[PDB]
Ligand binder design. Structure first.
Ligand SMILES: *[C@@H]1O[C@H](CO)[C@@H](O[C@@H]2O[C@H](CO)[C@@H](O[C@@H]3O[C@H](CO[C@H]4O[C@H](CO)[C@@H](O)[C@H](O[C@H]5O[C@H](CO)[C@@H](O)[C@H](O)[C@@H]5O[C@H]5O[C@H](CO)[C@@H](O)[C@H](O)[C@@H]5O)[C@@H]4O)[C@@H](O)[C@H](O[C@H]4O[C@H](CO)[C@@H](O)[C@H](O)[C@@H]4O)[C@@H]3O)[C@H](O)[C@H]2NC(C)=O)[C@H](O)[C@H]1NC(C)=O
Ligand SMILES: N#Cc1ccc(/C=C/C(=O)N2CC[C@@H]3CN(C(=O)c4ccc5[nH]nnc5c4)C[C@@H]3CC2)cc1
Ligand SMILES: [Ca+2]
Ligand SMILES: [Ca+2]
Ligand SMILES: [Cl-]
Ligand SMILES: [Zn+2]
Length: 804
């Protein structure tokens, strides 16, 4: 119940929120069905439209008007935004030349430049160019401010997960809002667009910008708006708030537009009906920019123009149905659409086997427009697993398609031409970012970045300290004229050992044979020089990675490669090597096929053994530095050391062998030499972070040799590819992957064919940021370069997407 006979007189769009059962007058009172009777009367005036006309100038104030053209209106702070244009012969903001903003130009009492977030729902990245002729305001912002060609949203590319990601800098798995529709098993509750449930605070984790603001004494305007409040009333409300006395005036605001998402759903991303909503958005920006100019704030306020996601062509006839794959189609609940999530209909059912479901859905049709995964096997770049609201079974859907359960679910539950929510690397899902203001840069293009990064910057723009988040603070410093945040490298926690020759062959009982008894003054000091690390500046191009946790490990040098070897995990954490363009591929000679040599630098007790690999028939082994790329037949023996060896399922060796034998060389050719760092990853609990020694869920049978869940590689070269990787003078170029260590290749429906038809396709799907690998390994890369740390942070957040 709400006693709704209180009044809104003098309380229109209040900032503090009065709790039930007193009535409300704030921008969300409508969504709670708890506005005071007079709210519509007092706070939602509409009379006379939104624009001053020639006759309205210096009128006599009429409180019934939606906005005012009267002489006192500048003082009351409630003129129509075009009041100055018509009545005082002023120019629209958009018609004024782009002049640089070297210093904030703020009116007295303004302690800091305010921030306005202008959020546009469904604003697909390609609109900035494709619709530019009809969006002059937005185009002034873009070309005068700082902009990226596009901004990458989070997965799923849905509204709620993305709008709350923006506000927190957190992944959906972390903030809790993993979809527009969710079931929480511990709540036995369901979060949906229609219903009251979504209003409970228990769904919304993390700390959103406005809470972060308040707690640090920066006052915030309320971010969310009720749909029924027209957009023009939203802008004047932000302008009225900006006229408030210094002590009550918030420093951060948000505006939201349902367009163009609303139309895009009806008419597709580029339907001819799309021109108008874009025209309308632009108008609303114009209005805001005019309102700011009236207030002398247009050279004081930082404005962020940002979208939550893009829009793809989707229609009813492009739906795949589960009922065409499953028999037990009524045992399962499917959360449907542009992404699928599956669970049991009742947990009072022990005969629910996810494996059968996964199997029944795998490569079953040659045309198939989705692919099933257990959530932990989803690409690691999506970070879509560590939450109980994310169902074990996930369906990743082809762009342009839908997944539904039964055909009835579509005809009785076509009406739409557009949708979104696909994999966040898909082009049609990309969205926009423009920043304009005194703190942003002038006429500056920046490379594309991820929406998870903006919270840090917004906190910077406001002189706030960000709550712990998934952005990488400093990686967007290149957007800003002036910086609140100087980032610093984390300190190394573990210093390495540098073992020399300490053990004799016969001290080893590993069950590892090699034909190595093939056999100077000149060339016997030289290979010793290599073991002391004389070719280190060649294979370790950016300094050794730092270990950011306490552990026990040794740096091992060789002619061709260098490793940080973990005495705990009994394999290297990292293995670094440069392959120049002219380097040549060779084969494993017939006599060395099964060669594995003991490492005299490392104790038997801290080494693996071939015996275990013999006894485990699920588990074979592979090597981190590839024998195929040895510089010389002598050097090749280095690659067969027990300390270069890592466990690998036969199925995975196929992917790995192809990567090492063919692709490394190909990359070195195209990119003019590459530096490769490769290693194991252990993330059994799929939280995206390194598991500790006591969290290992799987060992090679009858041993203490832990089995990795993933294998990564970081491949780096010179951005200017006229220079060799090992002699780059400036900016670097990187690409990375985190391959899932899986006992089969069921993910690749073409796997029965030659590795040249599927393997690179798997690796592209599993691309990664260096920073994703950092979270997973507890390492810190690029410690020694000639580049600024900011630039290196940017490099570390880069993701190579393989889109056109
Ligand atoms: C991305 O960035 C985020 C934020 O920095 C990182 O997430 C953080 O990771 C650490 C380690 O996993 C977490 O620390 C643990 O914290 C708990 C207590 O946490 C409570 O307080 C904090 C602080 O205000 C809240 O943020 C927490 O909120 C979580 O739970 C609520 C429900 O209560 C939910 O509404 C939120 O969405 C959020 O849930 C998400 O995180 C939790 C993990 O806490 C996870 O279960 C869930 O699936 C969601 O994803 C919470 O109220 C503390 O008890 C722990 O200590 C224990 O472990 C240590 C191990 O050393 C033991 O020594 C000790 O004895 C304890 O047993 C941890 O310290 C931190 O909470 C978490 N923060 C957030 C906001 O998620 C991610 O790791 C980053 N991801 C990547 C890939 O980089
Ligand atoms: N940072 C930040 C920040 C800034 C502003 C804001 C502002 C938030 C805000 O007012 N809204 C966003 C959240 C939802 C969106 N919505 C929908 O009905 C809806 C829209 C598009 C869809 N496509 N497919 N299903 C869809 C469903 C109603 C609701 C109110 C409006 C939120 C966060
Ligand atoms: Ca949206
Ligand atoms: Ca983990
Ligand atoms: Cl296979
Ligand atoms: Zn939408």
């Amino acid at each position: 119940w709400t006693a709704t006979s209180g009044s809104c007189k003098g309380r229109c769009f209040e900032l503090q929120e009065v709790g039930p059962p007193d009535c409300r007058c704030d921008n969300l009172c409508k969504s709670y069905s708890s506005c005071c009777h007079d709210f519509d009367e007092l706070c939602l005036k509409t009379a006379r439209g939104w624009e001053c006309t020639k006759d309205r100038c210096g009128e006599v104030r009429n409180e019934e008007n939606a906005c005012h053209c009267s002489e006192d209106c500048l003082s009351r702070g409630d003129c129509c935004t075009n009041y100055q244009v018509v009545c005082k012969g002023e120019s629209h903001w958009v018609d004024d030349d782009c002049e640089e903003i070297k210093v904030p130009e703020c009116p007295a009492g303004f302690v800091r430049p305010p921030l306005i977030i202008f959020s546009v729902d469904g604003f697909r990245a390609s609109y900035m160019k494709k619709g530019s002729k009809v969006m002059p305001n937005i185009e002034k912002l873009r070309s005068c401010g700082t902009h990226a060609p596009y901004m990458r949203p989070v997965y799923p590319t849905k509204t709620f997960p993305n709008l709350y990601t923006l506000a927190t800098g957190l992944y959906p798995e972390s903030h809790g809002i993993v979809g527009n529709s969710m079931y929480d098993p511990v709540f036995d509750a369901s979060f949906h667009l229609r219903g009251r449930e979504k209003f409970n605070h228990r769904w919304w984790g993390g700390q959103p910008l406005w809470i972060t603001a308040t707690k640090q004494g920066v006052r915030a305007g309320t971010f969310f708006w009720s749909v029924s409040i027209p957009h023009e009333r939203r802008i004047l409300t932000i302008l009225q708030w900006l006229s408030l006395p210094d002590n009550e005036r918030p420093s951060v605001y948000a505006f939201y537009s349902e367009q163009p998402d609303f139309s895009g759903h009806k008419y597709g991303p580029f339907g001819p009906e799309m021109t108008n909503p874009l025209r309308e958005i632009d108008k609303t920006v114009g209005q805001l920019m005019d309102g700011l100019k009236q207030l002398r704030l247009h050279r004081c306020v930082n404005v962020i123009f940002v979208g939550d996601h893009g829009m793809e062509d989707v229609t009813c006839d492009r739906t795949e149905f589960l009922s065409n794959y499953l028999t037990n189609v009524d045992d399962i609940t499917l959360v449907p659409g542009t992404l699928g999530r599956i669970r049991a209909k009742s947990i009072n059912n022990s005969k629910y086997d996810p494996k059968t479901i996964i199997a029944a859905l795998t490569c079953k049709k040659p045309d198939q427009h989705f692919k099933p995964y257990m959530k932990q096997h989803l690409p690691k770049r999506l970070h879509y697993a560590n939450n109980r609201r994310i169902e074990d079974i996930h369906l990743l859907v082809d762009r342009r398609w839908h997944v539904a359960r039964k055909p009835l679910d579509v005809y009785k539950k076509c009406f739409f031409q557009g949708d979104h929510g696909f994999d966040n690397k898909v082009n049609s899902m990309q969205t926009v970012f423009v920043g304009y203001g005194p703190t942003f840069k002038y006429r500056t293009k920046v490379p594309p970045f991820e929406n998870i990064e903006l919270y840090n910057v917004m906190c910077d723009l406001l002189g706030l300290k960000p709550a712990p988040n998934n952005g990488t603070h400093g990686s967007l410093n290149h957007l800003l004229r002036t910086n609140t945040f100087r980032p610093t490298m984390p300190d190394e926690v573990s210093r390495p050992n540098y073992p020399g020759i300490m053990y004799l062959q016969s001290e080893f009982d590993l069950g590892c044979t090699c034909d190595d008894k093939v056999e100077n003054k000149l060339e016997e000091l030289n290979k010793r020089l290599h073991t002391k690390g004389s070719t280190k500046e060649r294979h370790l191009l950016y300094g050794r990675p730092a270990v950011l946790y306490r552990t026990s490990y040794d740096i091992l040098y060789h002619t061709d490669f260098e490793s940080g070897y973990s005495e705990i995990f009994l394999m290297p954490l990292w293995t670094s090597y440069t392959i120049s363009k002219q380097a040549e591929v060779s084969s494993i000679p017939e006599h060395l096929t099964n060669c594995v040599r003991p490492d005299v630098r490392v104790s038997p007790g801290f080494s693996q053994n071939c015996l275990a690999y013999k006894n485990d028939k699920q588990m074979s082994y592979g090597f981190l530095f590839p024998p195929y790329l040895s510089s010389s037949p002598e050097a090749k023996y280095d690659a067969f050391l027990v300390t270069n060896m890592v466990p690998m399922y036969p199925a995975f060796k196929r992917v790995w062998a192809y990567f090492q034998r063919v692709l490394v060389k190909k990359y070195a050719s195209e990119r003019n030499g590459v530096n490769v760092i490769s290693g194991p990853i252990f993330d059994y609990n799929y939280d995206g972070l390194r598991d500790t020694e006591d969290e290992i869920k799987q060992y090679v049978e009858g041993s203490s040799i832990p089995v990795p869940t993933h294998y990564y590689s970081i491949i780096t070269s010179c951005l200017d590819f006229t220079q060799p990787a090992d002699k780059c003078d400036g900016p670097l170029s990187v690409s990375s992957f985190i391959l899932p260590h899986r006992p089969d290749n069921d993910e690749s429906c073409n796997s029965s064919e030659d590795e040249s038809k599927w393997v690179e396709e798997l690796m592209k799907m599993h691309t990664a940021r260096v920073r994703d690998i950092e979270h997973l390994t507890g390492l810190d890369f690029y410690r020694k370069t000639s580049r600024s740390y900011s630039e290196i942070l940017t490099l570390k957040t880069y993701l190579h997407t393989y889109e056109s």
